Design a protein around this ligand. Structure first.
Ligand code: SF4
Lengths: 286, 289
């Protein structure tokens, strides 16, 4: 039947691009997928739809008075491989919870039966700069059971994974939401794959795939398309295909073991990222 | 006339180092300052204390278990230049609003009237990756009147600056929140300064200062300190003194005019940051065209 998944991760590391490329490979693979973007910014579906900006449930809800009038064919658009797409949107900056649009989107897609009309996978593309309120909603309310975290060999990207992992632990007994693995969005750093393999193993999970940097990505993106649709013969298309296959066959769905800041700093030092703390040099620079 | 300000900015671009070096320069100027870090991670005060990490309210509100119970000795540590350094901390991921650490910290400080105890400036150091009721609090409750936005010539940093501006807009009437200007932390991008100047102009504000990249910052950072206390005779040290004096003497506090996504992307394109889309090849595979 359908598997409800979610790709979580900090902003600015190529997450939405990795999600849409993984989803296109799934669709190329024969799977029927729906992406539910949850970033207030709404940039989780444009490569599937070759679009400027998809109209968000929130923008619309603010138009015909409320979300009761909203039509499903106006909210959900289909694109490459038949992948269905919806954007939650979000409130105006500073007004309430920035990630609440998800609750509005999920509740609407529910009433409209969207989740039963031929779907093998549902992927919520959620931000993880903070894990609270609307952002933690797909986990809290047991809306996505298979969580895959996008990260890179950088402090903040790693910190976010840890806190998201924390969020999963907190709702452990709450449902069947579990961590399926870390996806490394390479930032062309030395020993980056090793660094994430190191953290995933420390978390009690797996680095399900290391996504290399490759210009073909931007060449595909400038045309509002995924690498799978733009250049199927490319080396990078295979990478997304590999990820897709492992996600499809994934069996490792665990309750993570959140590390501590010191461990975090340990991996970073250990892998050529952070420098070992000199000591005579502190407190009284000169 | 104690001035309450806030430095907002996207994370990952040295904002806190700028806030701290800014406050240090201010301190050297003989100004009495206090930094309220409102970042979950809590790195808004290390450089001032020469610490690895300062204890937050949240953490020690989970020791005594009750919001109020921490004389400013264990919670409010004064460090370099007499700058009082405090940290809000945040709650556990999934435990209520992450802005609980902020909303807490202030009331607590207003309860000890730490604001009234010999102070010229208070700077809340807040992250702008998420502009929601939780983190817009200082603005919303009228806790911070003078806002300064740290940004760089990059998409998210400028997007974050526009969103902070939207939040300033929203409350410009209920209180006296105003945007003092943009602070560009250079990330070594061409035309970065001119891009931010341009953005300042569009937003209807000013780029109060361009903070350059100087390895003496990373140098003094390792020492767990500011560039000011480190080597006050550094060329970079003078950039903070300059920014500081413009902050002290800033008359220009305005209500920002946010721009649309087009205007922003427009800006980004004319400065060579964002690629101009070729309409014809959109949705065509590499073999087709
Ligand atoms: S729960 Fe988080 S995203 Fe929501 S308003 Fe609070 S701090 Fe912001």
């Amino acid at each position: 039947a359908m598997r409800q998944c979610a790709i979580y991760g900090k902003g600015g590391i190529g997450k939405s691009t990795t999600t849409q490329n993984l989803v296109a490979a799934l669709a190329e693979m024969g799977k029927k997928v729906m992406i539910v973007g949850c970033d207030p910014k709404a940039d989780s579906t444009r490569l599937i739809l070759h679009s400027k900006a998809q109209n968000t449930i929130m923008e619309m809800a603010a138009e015909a008075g409320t979300v009761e009038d909203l039509e499903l064919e106006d909210v959900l658009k289909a694109g490459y491989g038949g992948v269905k797409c919806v954007e939650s949107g979000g409130p105006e900056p500073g007004v309430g919870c920035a990630g609440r649009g998800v609750i509005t989107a999920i509740n609407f897609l529910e009433e409209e039966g969207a989740y039963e009309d031929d779907l093998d996978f549902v992927f919520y593309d959620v931000l993880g700069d903070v894990v609270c309120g609307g952002f933690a909603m797909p986990i809290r309310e047991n809306k996505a059971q298979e969580i895959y975290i996008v990260c890179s060999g950088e402090m903040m990207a790693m910190y976010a994974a840890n806190n998201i992992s924390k969020g999963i632990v907190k709702y452990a007994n709450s449902g069947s939401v579990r961590l399926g693995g870390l996806i490394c969005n390479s930032r062309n750093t030395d020993r980056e794959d090793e660094l994430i393999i190191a953290l995933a193993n420390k978390l009690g999970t797996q680095m399900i795939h290391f996504v290399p940097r490759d210009n073909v990505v931007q060449r595909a993106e400038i045309r509002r398309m995924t690498v799978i649709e733009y250049d199927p013969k490319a080396k990078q298309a295979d990478e997304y295909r590999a990820l897709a296959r492992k996600v499809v066959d994934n069996k490792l769905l665990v309750i993570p073991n959140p590390i501590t800041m010191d461990e975090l700093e340990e991996l970073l030092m250990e892998f050529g990222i952070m420098e070992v703390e000199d000591e005579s040099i502190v407190g009284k620079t000169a």
